[PDB]
Short mmCIF file of C-alpha atoms in Angstrom, two decimals:
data_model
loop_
_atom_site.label_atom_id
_atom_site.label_comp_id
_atom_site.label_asym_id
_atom_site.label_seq_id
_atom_site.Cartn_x
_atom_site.Cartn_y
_atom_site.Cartn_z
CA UNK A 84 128.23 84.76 49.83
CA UNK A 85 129.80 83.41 52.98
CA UNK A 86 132.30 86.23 53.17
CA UNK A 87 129.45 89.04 53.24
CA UNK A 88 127.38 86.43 56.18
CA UNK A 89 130.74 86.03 57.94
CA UNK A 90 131.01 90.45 58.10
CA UNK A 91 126.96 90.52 58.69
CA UNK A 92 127.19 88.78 62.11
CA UNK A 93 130.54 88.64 63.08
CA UNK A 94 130.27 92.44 64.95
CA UNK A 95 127.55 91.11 67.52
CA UNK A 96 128.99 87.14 67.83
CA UNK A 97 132.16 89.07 68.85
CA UNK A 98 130.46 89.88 72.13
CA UNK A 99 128.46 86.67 72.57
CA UNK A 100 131.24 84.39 72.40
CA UNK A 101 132.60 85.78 75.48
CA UNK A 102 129.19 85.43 77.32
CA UNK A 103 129.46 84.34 81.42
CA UNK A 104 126.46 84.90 83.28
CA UNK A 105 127.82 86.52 86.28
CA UNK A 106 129.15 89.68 84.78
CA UNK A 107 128.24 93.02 86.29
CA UNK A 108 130.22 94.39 83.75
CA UNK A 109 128.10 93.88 81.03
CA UNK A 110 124.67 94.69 83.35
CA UNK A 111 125.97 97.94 84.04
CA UNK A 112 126.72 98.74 80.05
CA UNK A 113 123.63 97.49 79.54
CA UNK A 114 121.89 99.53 82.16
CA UNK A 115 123.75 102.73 80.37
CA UNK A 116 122.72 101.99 76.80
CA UNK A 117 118.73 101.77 77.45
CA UNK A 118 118.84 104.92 79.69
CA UNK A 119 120.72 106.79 76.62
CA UNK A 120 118.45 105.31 74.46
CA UNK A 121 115.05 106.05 76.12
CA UNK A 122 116.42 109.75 76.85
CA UNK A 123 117.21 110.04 73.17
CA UNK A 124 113.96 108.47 72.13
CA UNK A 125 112.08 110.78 74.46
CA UNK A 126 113.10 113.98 73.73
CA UNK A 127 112.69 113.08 69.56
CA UNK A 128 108.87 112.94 70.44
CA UNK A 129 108.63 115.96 72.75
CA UNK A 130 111.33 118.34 71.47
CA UNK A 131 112.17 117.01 68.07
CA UNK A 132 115.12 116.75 68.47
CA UNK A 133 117.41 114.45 66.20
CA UNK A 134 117.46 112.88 62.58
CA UNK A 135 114.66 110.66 62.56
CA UNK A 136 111.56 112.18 62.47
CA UNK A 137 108.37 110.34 61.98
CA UNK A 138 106.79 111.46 58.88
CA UNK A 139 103.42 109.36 59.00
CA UNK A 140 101.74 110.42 62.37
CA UNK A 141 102.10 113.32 64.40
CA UNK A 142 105.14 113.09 66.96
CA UNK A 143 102.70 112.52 69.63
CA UNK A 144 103.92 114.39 72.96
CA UNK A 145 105.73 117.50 70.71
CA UNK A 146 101.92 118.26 69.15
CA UNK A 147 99.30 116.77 70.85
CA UNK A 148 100.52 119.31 73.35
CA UNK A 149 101.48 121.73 70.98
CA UNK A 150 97.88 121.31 70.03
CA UNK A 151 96.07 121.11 73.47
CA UNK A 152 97.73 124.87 73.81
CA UNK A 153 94.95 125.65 70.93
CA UNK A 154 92.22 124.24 72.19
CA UNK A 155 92.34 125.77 75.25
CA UNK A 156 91.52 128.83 73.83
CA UNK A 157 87.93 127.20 72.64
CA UNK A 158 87.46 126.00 76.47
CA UNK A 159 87.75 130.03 77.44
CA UNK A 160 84.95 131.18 75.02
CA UNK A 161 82.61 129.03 76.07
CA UNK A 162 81.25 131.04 79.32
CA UNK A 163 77.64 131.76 77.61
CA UNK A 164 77.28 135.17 80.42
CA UNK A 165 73.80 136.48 80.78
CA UNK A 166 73.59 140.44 79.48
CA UNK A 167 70.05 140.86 81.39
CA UNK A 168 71.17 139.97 84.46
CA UNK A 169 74.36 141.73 84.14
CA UNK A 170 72.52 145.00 83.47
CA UNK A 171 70.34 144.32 86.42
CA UNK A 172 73.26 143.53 89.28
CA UNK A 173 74.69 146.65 87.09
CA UNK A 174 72.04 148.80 88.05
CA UNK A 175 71.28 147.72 91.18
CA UNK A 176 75.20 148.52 91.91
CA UNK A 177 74.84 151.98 90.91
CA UNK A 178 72.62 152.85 93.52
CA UNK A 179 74.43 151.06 96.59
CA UNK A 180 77.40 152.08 95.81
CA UNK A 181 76.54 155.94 95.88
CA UNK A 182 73.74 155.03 98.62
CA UNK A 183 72.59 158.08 100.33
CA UNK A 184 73.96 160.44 98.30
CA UNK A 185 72.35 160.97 95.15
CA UNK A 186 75.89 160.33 93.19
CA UNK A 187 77.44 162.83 90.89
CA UNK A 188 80.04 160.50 88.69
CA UNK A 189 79.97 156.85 87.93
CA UNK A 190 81.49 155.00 90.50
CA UNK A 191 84.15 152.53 90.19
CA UNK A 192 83.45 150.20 92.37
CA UNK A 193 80.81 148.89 90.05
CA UNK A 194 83.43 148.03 87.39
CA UNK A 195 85.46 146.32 89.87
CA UNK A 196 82.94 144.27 91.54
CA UNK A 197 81.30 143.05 88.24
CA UNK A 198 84.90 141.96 86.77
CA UNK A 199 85.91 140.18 89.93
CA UNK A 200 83.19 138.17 89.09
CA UNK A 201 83.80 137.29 85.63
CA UNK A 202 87.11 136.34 86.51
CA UNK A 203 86.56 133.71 89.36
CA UNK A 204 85.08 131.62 86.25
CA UNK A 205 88.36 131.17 84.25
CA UNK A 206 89.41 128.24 87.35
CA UNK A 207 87.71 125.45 85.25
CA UNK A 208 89.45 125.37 82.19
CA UNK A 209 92.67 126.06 83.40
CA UNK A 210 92.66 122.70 85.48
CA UNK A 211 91.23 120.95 82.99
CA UNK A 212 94.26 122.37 80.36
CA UNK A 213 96.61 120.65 83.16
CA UNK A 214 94.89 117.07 83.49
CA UNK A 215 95.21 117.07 79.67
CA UNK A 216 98.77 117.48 79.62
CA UNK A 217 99.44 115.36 82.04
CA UNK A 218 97.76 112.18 80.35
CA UNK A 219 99.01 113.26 77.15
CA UNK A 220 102.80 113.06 78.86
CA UNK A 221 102.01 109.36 80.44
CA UNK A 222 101.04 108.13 76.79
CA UNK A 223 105.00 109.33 75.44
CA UNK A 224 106.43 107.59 78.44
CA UNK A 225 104.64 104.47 77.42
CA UNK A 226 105.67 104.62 73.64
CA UNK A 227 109.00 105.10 74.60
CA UNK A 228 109.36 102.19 77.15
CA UNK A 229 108.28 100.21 73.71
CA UNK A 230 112.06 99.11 73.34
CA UNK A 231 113.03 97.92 76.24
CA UNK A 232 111.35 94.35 75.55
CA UNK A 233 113.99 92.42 75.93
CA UNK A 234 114.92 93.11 79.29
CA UNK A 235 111.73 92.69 81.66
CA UNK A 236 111.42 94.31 84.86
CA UNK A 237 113.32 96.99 83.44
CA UNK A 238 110.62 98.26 81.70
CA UNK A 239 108.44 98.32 84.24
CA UNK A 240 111.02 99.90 86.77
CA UNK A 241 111.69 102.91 84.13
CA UNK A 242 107.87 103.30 83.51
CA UNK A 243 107.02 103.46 86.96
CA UNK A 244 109.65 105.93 88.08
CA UNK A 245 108.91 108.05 85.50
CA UNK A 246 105.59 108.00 85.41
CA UNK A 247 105.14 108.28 89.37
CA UNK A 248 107.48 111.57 88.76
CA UNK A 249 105.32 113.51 86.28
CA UNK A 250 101.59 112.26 88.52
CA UNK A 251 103.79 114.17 91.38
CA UNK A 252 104.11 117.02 89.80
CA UNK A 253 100.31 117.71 89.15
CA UNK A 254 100.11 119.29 93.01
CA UNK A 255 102.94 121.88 92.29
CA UNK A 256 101.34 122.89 88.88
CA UNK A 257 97.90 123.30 89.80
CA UNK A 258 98.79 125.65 92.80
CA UNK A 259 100.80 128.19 90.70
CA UNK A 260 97.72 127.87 87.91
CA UNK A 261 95.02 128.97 91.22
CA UNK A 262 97.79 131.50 92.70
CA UNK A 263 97.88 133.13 89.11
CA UNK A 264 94.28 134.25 89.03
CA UNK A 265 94.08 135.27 92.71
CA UNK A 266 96.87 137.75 91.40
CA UNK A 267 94.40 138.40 88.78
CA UNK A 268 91.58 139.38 90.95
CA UNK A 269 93.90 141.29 93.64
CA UNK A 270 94.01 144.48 92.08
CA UNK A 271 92.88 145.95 88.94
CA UNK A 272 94.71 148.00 86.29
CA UNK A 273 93.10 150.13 84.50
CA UNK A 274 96.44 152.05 82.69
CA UNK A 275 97.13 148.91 80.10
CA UNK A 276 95.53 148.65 76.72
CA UNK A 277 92.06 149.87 78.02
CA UNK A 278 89.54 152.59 76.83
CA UNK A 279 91.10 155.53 78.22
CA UNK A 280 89.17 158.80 78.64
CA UNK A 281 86.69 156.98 76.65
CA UNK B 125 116.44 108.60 85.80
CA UNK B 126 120.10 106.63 86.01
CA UNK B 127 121.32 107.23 89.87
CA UNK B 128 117.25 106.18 90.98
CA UNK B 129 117.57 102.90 88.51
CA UNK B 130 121.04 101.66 89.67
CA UNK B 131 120.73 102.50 93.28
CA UNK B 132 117.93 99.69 93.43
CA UNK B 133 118.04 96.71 95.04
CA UNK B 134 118.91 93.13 93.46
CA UNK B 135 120.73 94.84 89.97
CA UNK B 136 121.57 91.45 89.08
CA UNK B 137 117.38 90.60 88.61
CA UNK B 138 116.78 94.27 87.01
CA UNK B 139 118.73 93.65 84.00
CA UNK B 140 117.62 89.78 84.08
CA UNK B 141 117.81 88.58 80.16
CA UNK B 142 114.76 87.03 78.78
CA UNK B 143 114.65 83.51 77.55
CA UNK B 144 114.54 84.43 73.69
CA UNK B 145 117.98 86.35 74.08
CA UNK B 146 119.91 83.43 75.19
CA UNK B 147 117.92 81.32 72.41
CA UNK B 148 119.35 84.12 70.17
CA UNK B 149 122.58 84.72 70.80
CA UNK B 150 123.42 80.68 70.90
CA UNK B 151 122.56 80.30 67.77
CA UNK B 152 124.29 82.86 66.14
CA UNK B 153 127.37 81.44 67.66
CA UNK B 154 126.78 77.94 65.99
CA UNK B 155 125.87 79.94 62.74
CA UNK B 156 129.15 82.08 63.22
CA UNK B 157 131.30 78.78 63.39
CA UNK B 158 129.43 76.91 60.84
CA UNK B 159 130.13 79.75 58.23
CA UNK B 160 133.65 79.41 59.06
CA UNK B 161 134.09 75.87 58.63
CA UNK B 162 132.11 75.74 55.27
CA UNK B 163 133.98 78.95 54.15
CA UNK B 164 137.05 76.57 55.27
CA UNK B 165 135.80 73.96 53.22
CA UNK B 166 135.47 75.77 49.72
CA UNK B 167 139.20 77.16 50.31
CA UNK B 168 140.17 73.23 50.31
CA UNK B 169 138.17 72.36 47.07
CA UNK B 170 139.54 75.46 44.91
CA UNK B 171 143.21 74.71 45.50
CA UNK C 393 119.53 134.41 104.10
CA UNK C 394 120.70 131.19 105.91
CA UNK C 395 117.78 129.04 104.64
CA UNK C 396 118.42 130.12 101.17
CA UNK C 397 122.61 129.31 101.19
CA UNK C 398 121.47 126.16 102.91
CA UNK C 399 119.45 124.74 100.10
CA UNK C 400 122.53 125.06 97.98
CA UNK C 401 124.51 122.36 99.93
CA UNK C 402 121.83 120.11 100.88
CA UNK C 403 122.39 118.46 97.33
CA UNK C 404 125.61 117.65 97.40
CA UNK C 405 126.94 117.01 100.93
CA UNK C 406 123.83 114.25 101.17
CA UNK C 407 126.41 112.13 99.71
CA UNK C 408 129.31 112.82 101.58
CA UNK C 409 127.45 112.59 105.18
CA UNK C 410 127.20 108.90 103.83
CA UNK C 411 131.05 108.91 102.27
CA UNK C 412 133.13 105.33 103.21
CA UNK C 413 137.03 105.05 101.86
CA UNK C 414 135.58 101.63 100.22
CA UNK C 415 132.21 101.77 98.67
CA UNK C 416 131.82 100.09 94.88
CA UNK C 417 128.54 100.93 94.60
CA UNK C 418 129.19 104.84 95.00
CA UNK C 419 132.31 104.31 92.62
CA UNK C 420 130.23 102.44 89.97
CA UNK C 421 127.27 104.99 89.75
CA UNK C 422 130.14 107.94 89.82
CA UNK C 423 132.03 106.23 86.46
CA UNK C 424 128.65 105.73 84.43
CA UNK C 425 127.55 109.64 85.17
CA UNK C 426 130.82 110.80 84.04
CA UNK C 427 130.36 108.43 81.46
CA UNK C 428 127.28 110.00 80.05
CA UNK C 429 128.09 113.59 81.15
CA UNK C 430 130.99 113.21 78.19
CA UNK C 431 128.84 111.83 75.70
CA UNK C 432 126.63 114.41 75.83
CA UNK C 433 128.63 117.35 76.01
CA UNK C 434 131.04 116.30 73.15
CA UNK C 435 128.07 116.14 71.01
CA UNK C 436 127.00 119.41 71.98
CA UNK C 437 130.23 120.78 71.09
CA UNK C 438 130.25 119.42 67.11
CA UNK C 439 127.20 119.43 66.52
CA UNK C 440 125.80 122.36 67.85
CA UNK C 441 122.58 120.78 70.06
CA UNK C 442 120.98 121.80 72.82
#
């Protein structure tokens, strides 16, 4: 009985008998150890990545994201257009376009101008898909800064830094989501999967 | 994340202990020693 | 052309423009990156990660 209590704690009491306060030694392998082991910790959540996978909730970051990817596709089917007043502007874009002529062919123009408008709509949910992420992301960092405890202000330097990082990064994200629909609207391609010759 | 942590000021108040660590770690060094000296003891008595 | 080739120093030589014969604190931040840099890639190597 003593012999197994002696093997239990002698591996940590090893280090502690050997304690002095002023030791940057030890701060600095300290420092190392909880940034390995919140790197570690937060790439199990996201990428899944490791040996010990939680097998009671859902890995949190890995797919409530994996899952806000497939909801967004519910927030771009809920535009509710109007057909009458799309047949009307229709219509009414017939006959301005070929103006004083009496018009011999369908004009294009129509197709683009209706379609241009359609697609200035799809802004909304796309920065709503980002805010999402973004506060799904801040909830991992939190979970992960979970076991750091013992060393205070340390935990709330790592959860600051990284959480001011990822808020930062909203400005960058949002302007490539807005440049990728004014590419959208720019010029229109009518040679892809489309009803050709019709 | 580790050159923006260590290149903080006052590193010897980021990685600041808390107050149940040292209550922890003393008294697994008088439970270390103890165990010894008991263990000690019962080598004595067998002969 | 410049700008571009210019952007590929800027990371590096912003801590040599600062570079003293005798500085700890750029020693001790240089041993725990090389620290971790190893850890990481002998991992990778065995078991097959990343």
């Amino acid at each position: 009985k003593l012999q197994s209590q002696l093997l239990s704690i002698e591996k940590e009491v090893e280090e502690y008998k050997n304690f002095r306060p002023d030791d940057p030694a030890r701060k600095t392998k300290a420092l190392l150890q909880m940034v390995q082991q919140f790197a570690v910790d937060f790439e199990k959540r996201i990428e899944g990545s490791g040996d010990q996978i939680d097998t009671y909730e859902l890995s949190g970051g890995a797919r409530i994201n994996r899952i806000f990817h497939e909801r967004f596709p519910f927030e771009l089917v809920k535009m509710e257009f109007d057909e009458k007043e799309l047949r009307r502007e229709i219509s009414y874009a017939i006959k301005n376009i070929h103006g004083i002529r009496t018009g011999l062919f369908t004009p294009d123009m129509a197709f683009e101008t209706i379609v241009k408008k359609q697609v200035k709509k799809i802004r909304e949910p796309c920065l709503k898909c980002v805010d999402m992420v973004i506060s799904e992301l801040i909830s991992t960092v939190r979970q992960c800064t979970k076991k750091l405890q013992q060393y205070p202000r340390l935990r709330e330097e790592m959860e600051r830094i990284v959480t001011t990082h990822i808020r930062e990064r909203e400005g960058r994200t949002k302007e490539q989501v807005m440049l990728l629909i004014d590419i959208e609207l720019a010029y229109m391609n009518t040679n892809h999967e489309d009803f050709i010759g019709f | 994340l580790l050159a923006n942590l260590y290149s903080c000021g006052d590193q010897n108040t980021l990685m600041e202990e808390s107050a149940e660590q040292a209550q922890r770690r003393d008294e697994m060094l008088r439970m270390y020693h103890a165990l010894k000296e008991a263990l000690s003891i019962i080598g004595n008595i067998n002969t």
